[PDB]
Ligand binder design. Structure first.
Ligand SMILES: Nc1nc2c(ncn2[C@@H]2O[C@H](COP(=O)(O)OP(=O)(O)O)[C@@H](O)[C@H]2O)c(=O)[nH]1
Ligand SMILES: [Mg+2]
Length: 169
């Protein structure tokens, strides 16, 4: 009576893909972590009384020139696209990543969740909550800001993509 889902985490380098995922999976804010390796974490979570077996694909990250690997579109039930609120570059790149993703999958009307990470770095913020929300609305995607240092924000992100998936289902 369990349900397995595979979620791919995408985004520009250093926006916090690994840190967010690991904060969710192990409940800890890791300080150091290999900058390039693509790894698939496993996580068990019960949402709405429903148990889920999650496979979280923490990708190596991509940019305007990346050529999406097949592993980005096979058996993926949902995608989390993250950018850093401290980087306009990561924000402009997440738009390109979204476009490439739609090109690679087609019109599958895939479940997508946009995430503006690093919200704790108040001083270095350059992307507003409104800009992030406007983008998500442009895509009709879920939206949330987060901080790999605040476990509850990381949990909300993953719970949210699960609901988006169920909704599009
Ligand atoms: N302050 C702060 N630093 C973060 C956050 N998320 C990631 N980082 C830091 O940003 C750097 C890159 O994070 P990492 O997860 O490796 O990025 P990735 O390449 O997107 O997976 C590391 O030095 C992290 O400690 C966050 O929410 N807040
Ligand atoms: Mg990483």
């Amino acid at each position: 009576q369990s349900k397995s889902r595979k979620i791919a985490i995408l985004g520009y380098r250093s926006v916090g893909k690994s840190s967010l995922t690991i904060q969710f999976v192990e409940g800890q804010f890791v300080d150091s972590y290999d900058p390039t390796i693509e790894n698939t974490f496993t996580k068990l979570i019960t949402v709405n009384g429903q148990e889920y077996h999650l496979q979280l694909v923490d990708t190596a990250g991509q940019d305007e020139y990346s050529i999406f690997p097949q592993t980005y579109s096979i058996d993926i039930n949902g995608y989390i696209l993250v950018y850093s609120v401290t980087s306009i570059k990561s924000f402009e790149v997440i738009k390109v990543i979204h476009g490439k993703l739609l090109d690679m999958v087609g019109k599958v009307q895939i479940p997508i969740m946009l995430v503006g990470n690093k919200k704790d770095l108040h001083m270095e913020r350059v992307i507003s909550y409104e800009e992030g929300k406007a983008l998500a609305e442009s895509w009709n995607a879920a939206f949330l800001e987060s901080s790999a240092k605040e476990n509850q924000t990381a949990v909300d992100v993953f719970r949210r993509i699960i609901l988006e998936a169920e909704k599009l289902e």
